[PDB]
């Protein structure tokens, strides 16, 4: 992924901002409101059966933390992305099939997140500089099945 | 197919827009534009610059068409039928184009109505647009 | 959304097709399970193997819900509104797993119509089977 | 990609039999009448009008020709299909901004003509590996996107 010198800065001052506690369980949270089909993947979570029995499952908030501990690393080595997830590829690709549109659906739920936390600070530049990293992280996933 | 829960979902949320239409129809569009070049292609005489005069002038149809949608979300085909003639079959908008602009207004609206976009009604308002989205791409004239 | 050309070849198609639906229902079923494996995960107590009873007597089944669908292609949510419970709400179904789907029924229909698979043809039943599939795929209840 | 021998011998034994001539056209014929949109980037082509103009077009026929050609070279190189579709990836990716799907998409159009073309002969087993080819073709095809 290439983040303009003036793209990163966006990116990490708005990211040291993020409640690394809270924005992966809502980001995992939404996905799984919003494109239910992607439960089947986490039916050993628990109750899912409405969105706020997702929103409010501990396993889906705690997993969230892994997850956005993750885009995290991503963001930390932009240099060396798919590398970074080469071990999470296997897992996704090999093991779980996970379609990779899924991959997708979920770095752009995070944007809406991230979008709907910082409101008129996400402006269109940073959320620009967002969408690389995430597409990034994304064909990082998807790697193995290429 | 929107669920009852959906067209109420989508008549809350959209109706809380109203005056904000240009607005943020042309604030999904510079999104759309910075975040996925690509896009452009399809503007070729328009100047999209930041703060452009047809950006905004072109965002508030967009969001009025949306506006007329959700008054005739029971019947989008033939409400939207101009529009998916335009589309569809004279500007052949690849169908990718479309989900871009969905999820940036998806972002927009995430951005300015906080207590509004819950998840329920983030997922009413994905299925709003990709109905709208299927209609503006589909040839059933 | 489905235009009058693309109902009239839908019906003329699946109307030829006749009483070989259930059969193409079932090597449809059978070719996806060969070329795409991960769509077995659905279908765990199946005996999936070539020719096996239950993947033909679902395959008739698939064929006879297409077969309803043919003839309420005006009120398909209505119709498919059970199947759509089963596999939008219950299953779960990843929508992929539908393209799939549709695809080898396409493949199965160009391998036993050589005569009538024409370009016009494959577009309209496309077109009904993406649209059924966003039916069985909708949670509109 | 992987293909296993009983797979990338079937493919070949098929692959002997069909019409270089032609079968390139009709794909690129059926995507177009089956996926309008793509109409969009053959202006310079003519006619596409209606079903019988799209298939009969000179330009369709000729240009299908070159496309059948890449994927006859493709199947020569089985095990390098990102090498091999390195040039067309650039052109497709940054030049032509062809959105991936429609490598996809184009992929599965041929198999419905393959199937066209060789009916009973065109069976599951054999389907089953000649995905395994236009999926390999497609990423390939999509690589500068990664
Ligand atoms: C797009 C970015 C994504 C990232 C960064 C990501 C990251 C992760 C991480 C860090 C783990 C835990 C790894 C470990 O246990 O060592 C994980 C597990 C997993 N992920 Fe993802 N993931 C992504 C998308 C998805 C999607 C879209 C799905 C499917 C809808 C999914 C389904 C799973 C499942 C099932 C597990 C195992 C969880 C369990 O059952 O305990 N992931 N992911
Ligand atoms: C939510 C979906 C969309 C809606 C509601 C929508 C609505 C509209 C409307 C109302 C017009 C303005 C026509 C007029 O002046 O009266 C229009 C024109 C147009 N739209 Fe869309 N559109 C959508 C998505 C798209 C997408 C995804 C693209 C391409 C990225 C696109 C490209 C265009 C173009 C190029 C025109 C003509 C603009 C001009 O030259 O003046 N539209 N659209
Ligand atoms: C055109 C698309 C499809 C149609 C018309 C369709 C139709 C049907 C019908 C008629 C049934 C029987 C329902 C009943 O017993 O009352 C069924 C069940 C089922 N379908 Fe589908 N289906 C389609 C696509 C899919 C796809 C893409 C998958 C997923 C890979 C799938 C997975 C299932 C499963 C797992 C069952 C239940 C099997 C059992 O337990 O007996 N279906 N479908
Ligand atoms: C997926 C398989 C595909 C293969 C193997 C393929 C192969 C080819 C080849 C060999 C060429 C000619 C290269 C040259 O001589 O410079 C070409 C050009 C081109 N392709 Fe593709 N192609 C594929 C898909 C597509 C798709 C899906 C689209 C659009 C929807 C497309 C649009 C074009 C265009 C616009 C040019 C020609 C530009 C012109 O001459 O005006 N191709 N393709
Ligand atoms: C660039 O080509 C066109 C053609 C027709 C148009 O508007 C008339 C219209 C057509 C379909 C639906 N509503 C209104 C527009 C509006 O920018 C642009
Ligand atoms: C209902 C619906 C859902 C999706 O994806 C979530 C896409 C299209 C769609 O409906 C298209 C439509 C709407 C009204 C009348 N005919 C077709
Ligand atoms: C008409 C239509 C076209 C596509 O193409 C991808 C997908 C879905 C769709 O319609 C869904 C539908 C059908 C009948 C009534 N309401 C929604």
Redesign the pocket.
Same mark, same amino acid.
Do not use: I
């Given at each position: 992924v290439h983040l303009t010198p003036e793209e990163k800065s966006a990116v990490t001052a708005l990211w040291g901002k993020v409640n690394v506690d809270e924005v992966g369980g809502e980001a995992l949270g939404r996905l799984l409101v919003v494109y239910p089909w992607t439960q089947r993947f986490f039916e050993s979570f628990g109750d899912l059966s409405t969105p706020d029995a997702v929103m409010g499952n501990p396993k889906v908030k705690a997993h969230g933390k892994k997850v956005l501990g993750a885009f995290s690393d991503g963001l930390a080595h932009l240099d060396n992305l798919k590398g970074t997830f080469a071990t999470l590829s296997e897992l996704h690709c090999d093991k779980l099939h996970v379609d990779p549109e899924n991959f997708r659906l979920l770095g752009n739920v995070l944007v809406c997140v991230l979008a709907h936390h910082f409101g008129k600070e996400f402006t269109p530049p940073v959320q620009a500089a967002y969408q690389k990293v995430v597409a990034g992280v994304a064909n990082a996933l998807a790697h193995k099945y290429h | 197919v929107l669920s009852p829960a959906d067209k109420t979902n989508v008549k809350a949320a959209w109706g809380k827009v109203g005056a904000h239409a240009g607005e943020y129809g042309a604030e999904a569009l510079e999104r759309?534009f910075l975040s996925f070049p690509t896009?452009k292609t399809? @503007?070729p005489? @328009?100047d999209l610059s930041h703060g452009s005069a047809?950006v905004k002038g +072109?965002g508030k149809? *967009? %969001?009025? %068409? /949306?506006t007329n %949608?959700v008054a005739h979300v029971d019947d989008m085909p033939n409400a939207?039928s101009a529009?998916s003639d =335009? +589309?569809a079959h004279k500007?052949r *908008?690849d169908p990718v184009? @479309?989900k =871009? /602009?969905?999820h940036c /207004?998806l972002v927009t609206l995430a951005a300015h109505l906080p207590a509004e976009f819950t998840p329920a009604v983030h997922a009413s308002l994905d299925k709003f =647009?990709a109905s709208?989205?299927t209609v /503006?791409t589909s040839k059933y004239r």
């Amino acid at each position: 992924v290439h983040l303009t010198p003036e793209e990163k800065s966006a990116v990490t001052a708005l990211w040291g901002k993020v409640n690394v506690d809270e924005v992966g369980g809502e980001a995992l949270g939404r996905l799984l409101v919003v494109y239910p089909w992607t439960q089947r993947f986490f039916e050993s979570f628990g109750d899912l059966s409405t969105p706020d029995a997702v929103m409010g499952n501990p396993k889906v908030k705690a997993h969230g933390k892994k997850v956005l501990g993750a885009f995290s690393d991503g963001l930390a080595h932009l240099d060396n992305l798919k590398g970074t997830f080469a071990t999470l590829s296997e897992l996704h690709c090999d093991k779980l099939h996970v379609d990779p549109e899924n991959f997708r659906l979920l770095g752009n739920v995070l944007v809406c997140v991230l979008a709907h936390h910082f409101g008129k600070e996400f402006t269109p530049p940073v959320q620009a500089a967002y969408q690389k990293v995430v597409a990034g992280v994304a064909n990082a996933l998807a790697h193995k099945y290429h | 197919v929107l669920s009852p829960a959906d067209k109420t979902n989508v008549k809350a949320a959209w109706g809380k827009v109203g005056a904000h239409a240009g607005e943020y129809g042309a604030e999904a569009l510079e999104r759309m534009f910075l975040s996925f070049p690509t896009t452009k292609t399809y @503007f070729p005489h @328009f100047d999209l610059s930041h703060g452009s005069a047809q950006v905004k002038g +072109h965002g508030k149809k *967009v %969001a009025d %068409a /949306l506006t007329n %949608a959700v008054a005739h979300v029971d019947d989008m085909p033939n409400a939207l039928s101009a529009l998916s003639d =335009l +589309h569809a079959h004279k500007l052949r *908008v690849d169908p990718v184009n @479309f989900k =871009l /602009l969905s999820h940036c /207004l998806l972002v927009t609206l995430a951005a300015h109505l906080p207590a509004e976009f819950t998840p329920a009604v983030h997922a009413s308002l994905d299925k709003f =647009l990709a109905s709208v989205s299927t209609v /503006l791409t589909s040839k059933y004239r």
